Design an enzyme around this catalytic site. Structure first.
Site, short mmCIF file in Angstrom:
data_model
loop_
_atom_site.label_atom_id
_atom_site.label_comp_id
_atom_site.label_asym_id
_atom_site.label_seq_id
_atom_site.Cartn_x
_atom_site.Cartn_y
_atom_site.Cartn_z
N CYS A 108 0.78 -1.24 0.00
CA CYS A 108 0.00 0.00 0.00
C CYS A 108 0.82 1.29 0.00
CB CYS A 108 -0.96 0.02 1.20
SG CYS A 108 -2.07 1.46 1.25
N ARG A 111 -0.06 4.55 2.83
CA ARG A 111 0.08 4.42 4.27
C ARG A 111 0.39 5.67 5.09
NH1 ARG A 111 3.99 -0.50 4.74
NH2 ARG A 111 4.48 -0.03 2.54
N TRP A 280 -9.36 5.91 -0.74
CA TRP A 280 -9.73 6.66 -1.94
C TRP A 280 -8.76 6.26 -3.05
CZ3 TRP A 280 -8.55 9.64 2.56
CH2 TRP A 280 -7.26 10.21 2.59
N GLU A 285 -5.04 3.63 -10.87
CA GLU A 285 -5.80 2.41 -10.65
C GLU A 285 -6.92 2.33 -11.68
OE1 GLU A 285 -6.68 1.13 -6.51
OE2 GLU A 285 -6.13 3.19 -6.00
C1 HEM Z 1 -6.38 6.50 1.99
C2 HEM Z 1 -6.13 6.16 0.71
C3 HEM Z 1 -5.44 5.04 0.22
C4 HEM Z 1 -4.75 5.05 -0.95
C5 HEM Z 1 -4.44 6.25 -1.88
C6 HEM Z 1 -4.28 3.69 -1.16
C7 HEM Z 1 -3.68 3.28 -2.36
C8 HEM Z 1 -3.41 1.95 -2.63
C9 HEM Z 1 -3.10 1.48 -3.98
C10 HEM Z 1 -2.76 2.39 -5.15
C11 HEM Z 1 -3.04 0.13 -3.90
C12 HEM Z 1 -2.81 -0.84 -5.06
C13 HEM Z 1 -4.17 -1.35 -5.53
C14 HEM Z 1 -4.08 -2.35 -6.67
O1 HEM Z 1 -3.21 -2.20 -7.57
O2 HEM Z 1 -4.90 -3.29 -6.68
C15 HEM Z 1 -3.26 -0.25 -2.51
C16 HEM Z 1 -3.12 -1.55 -1.99
C17 HEM Z 1 -3.39 -1.92 -0.67
N1 HEM Z 1 -3.90 -1.05 0.31
FE1 HEM Z 1 -4.03 0.95 0.23
N2 HEM Z 1 -4.65 2.84 -0.12
C18 HEM Z 1 -5.41 3.65 0.72
C19 HEM Z 1 -6.10 3.17 1.85
C20 HEM Z 1 -6.03 1.89 2.36
C21 HEM Z 1 -6.76 1.43 3.53
C22 HEM Z 1 -7.87 2.19 4.27
C23 HEM Z 1 -6.31 0.19 3.80
C24 HEM Z 1 -6.60 -0.63 4.92
C25 HEM Z 1 -7.17 -0.21 6.11
C26 HEM Z 1 -5.40 -0.15 2.73
C27 HEM Z 1 -4.83 -1.44 2.55
C28 HEM Z 1 -4.16 -1.88 1.40
C29 HEM Z 1 -3.74 -3.24 1.15
C30 HEM Z 1 -3.71 -4.40 2.16
C31 HEM Z 1 -3.25 -3.27 -0.14
C32 HEM Z 1 -2.69 -4.44 -0.95
C33 HEM Z 1 -3.87 -5.31 -1.43
C34 HEM Z 1 -3.44 -6.48 -2.29
O3 HEM Z 1 -2.42 -7.12 -1.97
O4 HEM Z 1 -4.14 -6.79 -3.29
N3 HEM Z 1 -5.21 0.89 1.85
N4 HEM Z 1 -3.53 0.88 -1.71
N1 LIG Z 2 -7.14 2.49 -3.37
C1 LIG Z 2 -7.54 1.29 -3.06
N2 LIG Z 2 -7.54 0.37 -4.02
C2 LIG Z 2 -7.95 -1.05 -3.85
C3 LIG Z 2 -7.62 -1.81 -5.13
C4 LIG Z 2 -8.32 -3.18 -5.19
C5 LIG Z 2 -8.13 -3.86 -6.56
N3 LIG Z 2 -8.99 -3.16 -7.51
C6 LIG Z 2 -8.44 -5.38 -6.53
O1 LIG Z 2 -9.26 -5.86 -7.30
N4 LIG Z 2 -7.77 -6.13 -5.64
C7 LIG Z 2 -7.96 -7.59 -5.52
C8 LIG Z 2 -6.62 -8.19 -5.02
C9 LIG Z 2 -5.65 -8.51 -6.19
N5 LIG Z 2 -4.36 -8.96 -5.66
C10 LIG Z 2 -9.16 -7.99 -4.62
N6 LIG Z 2 -9.61 -7.06 -3.78
O2 LIG Z 2 -9.68 -9.11 -4.70
N7 LIG Z 2 -7.91 0.98 -1.88
N8 LIG Z 2 -8.34 1.84 -0.88
O3 LIG Z 2 -8.72 1.38 0.17
O4 LIG Z 2 -8.34 3.04 -1.05
#
Ligand code: HEM
Ligand SMILES: N=C(NCCC[C@H](N)C(=O)N[C@@H](CCN)C(N)=O)N[N+](=O)[O-]
Ligand code: HEM
Ligand SMILES: N=C(NCCC[C@H](N)C(=O)N[C@@H](CCN)C(N)=O)N[N+](=O)[O-]
Ligand SMILES: C[C@H](O)[C@H](O)[C@H]1CNc2nc(N)[nH]c(=O)c2N1
Ligand SMILES: C[C@H](O)[C@H](O)[C@H]1CNc2nc(N)[nH]c(=O)c2N1
Ligand SMILES: OC[C@@H](O)[C@@H](O)[C@H](O)[C@H](O)CO
Ligand SMILES: OC[C@@H](O)[C@@H](O)[C@H](O)[C@H](O)CO
Ligand SMILES: [Zn+2]
Lengths: 411, 407
Positions: A108, A111, A280, A285
């Protein structure tokens, strides 16, 4: 031990000591690196040490390590485990735990916002209808009419593994995908299988290109149930371009709230199989992956035609030119509608500042370079030039198999 | 044991068994991945030689033959007697081609079997080295129709008679720190440049001064030599639509020729083994020109395009980036100088990977380096899972000579 990381653009070197607290495995070995692989009921015996490690971390964070409160709590939990084979987290511990799972998420890039998470405690939920109500409230709170607020809703933890709570949707809000008999796909190809499940479960599909999927919710290990999210709670943004008036006619739009709903949250040995969370979007993405992946909406050709680019040879970089414009459109549209979104330059710049701060106050910041670096313009973002160390700390968010592959249907 | 890699765009899954033959370490452990880190005796020698020879004889369908056994004994006898051994020309050629085949960070490996190998093991002096290098440059450049090549100088003996090319690449531009505190030329080459001046070179103090060669032979002090100006092909950069681009006064050389790595074959170490292929567009347009620590030209270009540089969200840096890269490709193609765009190069690597899994059981690959520095996910390699591991023969990094040489 001490491990150093270097930034090749600034020559700044950071020292990591936090990796020593890592327990879980990575998948790599001294002979092979699996850094680019996407996916490389407990016992009392193994549970108390996990509980202890966590409570020790929690009490140290509030500066009460070794206090009577700390010792009494360990004793209380030990007694609870031997007596019931599990234990319940206090509200404070749950909040601390959810925040740290995010802080520890190496993939992420957002963070820097970890300490600001709003935690909704849904451990008193008992039915699918109850889950629906909690989720609607989460969506409304998090959306906040466009001024997005990060949040997580936590349902009851796993007991014996036969009574799991699960949100079958991958994200609370997604568009349906439909496979046509001629082999083509209408809507989002990524959700064809789940869409078919919903239909089989009784959903009446409007069969369009942007149909918001219904929620399929499982409570206490029972068969899942279908619910439609109130349309008025689903914020969407029509995509247009600041200079190309024809862009709007592509008929594209996207939902404003990204809400991962299929991961498992581990806190002190306890497993929360239903823990939908949302923040958000980072622009890429949507603009790079959702719209341009060959296996998703795949709009590059249509956009390049409209721009009348030379598509006779890849060397004209027509794909690259169209990609930039599409991403400009996404950011412009969200900003115009006052819906929170962040561009990849701002997000990565903030992540570097966050990372440096973590190394200094925490002794490290596990990060997965493969996921942190944006899917476009990699090298013009600071993270591309930053060496990172990837390791697993708990509390954490983990992948879990889709429920339809494991659920025992009751009928 | 048997590992699988999946392509998330196509769903195609491949099985890897080749990693089982891996010998060297990766830097990672079960507790920590260092995938993004840039730089993670007679008794010892014979084992390495046997490993190598076995793979060589197996490659020529003569494993377990008498020739195989004979050669094996011949080398063993030679090592015990001379503490080392000499590779047959056939073994040297096979080894060099395989070091390239095993380079996990190289996206252009579909070309691996076509390497032209120049055997310079009979070289004895620095002037001899200069002659061999001029010939490599002329051959590889081939008036713009580049051909891959490698020139191999004498192998390491006792470590005090190492042949070394002090330069990082046969052809590079000098870098000078100015009073302004700013840097003139390529910032990446400031230290080496000063070493050249310290040695006598008469720096022209320009933005694109071709550095001289600093050659070391038999462990002696290195000497300077100027590559014949007429053998260094350069390409002035202009854009196909922006006439003002040519005003930036930019140009780049056509021959990329890494000269500071160490080639290991059957335990033998070749410390001076300059090699060359041809450029992938992004190398120049994205990294050399846009890295903040390099020519760092994004701002200048953005200004000329009259983009709104007030907010990062206008994606002005991204728009300028694509234009700079379109210009590099256009300039090279217009001058008939070989170059490959990132879309074509990555498509070829995927084909190469499939070939390798099918005929060799795998292909070590470093995703962090294989994925281009721009437009990552619109290239197929982004969606391709890869396994990184080390196989020999190989190309290894080695400390710069000026930090180890005893004058
Ligand atoms: C506040 C705004 C946030 C932004 C801008 C952000 C942005 C991102 C982005 C760009 C990704 C990659 C998504 C993808 O390619 O599928 C990601 C992954 C991730 N984020 Fe964040 N995130 C945010 C909030 C959060 C929150 C609220 C949580 C948890 C409480 C979180 C947990 C994670 C996790 C665990 C992953 C990896 C998921 C995976 O392995 O598929 N994120 N985040
Ligand atoms: N920016 C966020 N993006 C979440 C991206 C989720 C992504 N589109 C997705 O499909 N992830 C798969 C994980 C793929 N490794 C899933 N949730 O099953 N998350 N957020 O909390 O702000
Ligand atoms: C024929 C055309 C070739 C193409 C298009 C090609 C392209 C590339 C590219 C784009 C890189 C990354 C460069 C960087 O970012 O610094 C690279 C790395 C590399 N290539 Fe190739 N290559 C070619 C030929 C060769 C040859 C002929 C050899 C050796 C005989 C070779 C050995 C390597 C090695 C060892 C690396 C990694 C170097 C490092 O770790 O810094 N390449 N190649
Ligand atoms: N296209 C090639 N590109 C290689 C470019 C080398 C790169 N510019 C460079 O400076 N590499 C550093 C190492 C980079 N960590 C060195 N060899 O001293 N190679 N070729 O043979 O065709
Ligand atoms: C195969 C490769 O690991 C895969 O395509 C990864 C690469 N990096 C990524 N990075 C982010 N943020 N999201 C992804 O889905 C991926 N996919
Ligand atoms: C820190 C990080 O490892 C570094 O910036 C790497 C990333 N990927 C790369 N990939 C290639 N081809 N060349 C490079 O120089 C780099 N630099
Ligand atoms: O159509 C079902 C898919 O959305 C589902 O299988 C996802 O790919 C899975 O949840 C991993 O993202
Ligand atoms: O100016 C000297 C540098 O070019 C040199 O030290 C390189 O950084 C080194 O060869 C690694 O590329
Ligand atoms: Zn690793």
């Amino acid at each position: 031990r001490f491990l150093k990381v270097k930034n090749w653009e600034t020559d700044v070197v950071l020292t990591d000591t936090l990796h020593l607290k890592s327990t879980l495995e990575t998948g790599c070995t001294e002979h092979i690196c699996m850094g680019s692989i996407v996916l490389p009921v407990r016992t009392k015996d193994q549970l108390f040490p996990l509980a202890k490690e966590f409570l020790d971390q929690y009490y140290s964070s509030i500066k009460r390590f070794g206090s009577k409160a700390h010792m009494d709590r360990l004793e209380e939990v030990n007694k609870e485990i031997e007596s019931t084979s599990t234990y319940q987290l206090k509200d404070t511990e749950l909040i601390y735990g959810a925040k740290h799972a995010w802080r520890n998420a190496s993939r992420c890039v957002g963070r820097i916002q970890w300490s600001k998470l709003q935690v909704f405690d849904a451990r008193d939920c008992t039915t699918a209808h109850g889950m629906f109500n909690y989720i609607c409230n989460h969506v409304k709170y998090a959306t906040n009419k466009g001024n997005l607020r990060s949040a997580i809703t936590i349902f009851p933890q796993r007991t014996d593994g036969k009574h799991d709570f699960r949100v079958w949707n991958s994200q609370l809000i997604r568009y349906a995908g439909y496979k046509q008999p001629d082999g083509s796909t209408l809507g989002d190809p990524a959700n064809v299988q789940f869409t078919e499940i919903c239909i089989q479960q009784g959903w009446k599909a409007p069969r369009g290109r942007f149909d918001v999927l219904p929620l399929l919710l499982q409570a206490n290990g029972n068969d899942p149930e279908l619910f439609q999210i109130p349309p008025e709670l689903v914020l969407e943004v029509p995509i247009r371009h600041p200079k190309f008036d024809w862009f709007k006619d592509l008929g594209l739009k996207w939902y404003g709230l990204p809400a991962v709903s299929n991961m498992l949250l581990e806190i002190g040995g306890l497993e929360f199989s239903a823990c939908p969370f949302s923040g958000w979007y980072m622009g890429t993405e949507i603009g790079v992956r959702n719209y341009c992946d060959n296996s998703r909406y795949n709009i590059l050709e249509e956009v390049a035609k409209k721009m009348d680019l030379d598509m006779r040879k890849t060397s004209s970089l027509w794909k690259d030119q169209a990609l930039v414009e599409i991403n400009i459109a996404v950011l412009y549209s969200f900003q115009s509608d006052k819906v929170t979104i962040v561009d990849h330059h701002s997000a990565t710049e903030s992540f570097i500042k966050h990372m440096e701060n973590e190394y200094r106050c925490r002794g490290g910041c596990p990060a997965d370079w493969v996921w942190i670096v944006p899917p476009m313009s990699g090298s013009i973002t600071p993270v591309f030039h930053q060496e990172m160390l990837n390791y697993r700390l708990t509390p954490s968010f983990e992948y879990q198999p889709d429920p339809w592959n494991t659920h025992v249907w009751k009928g």
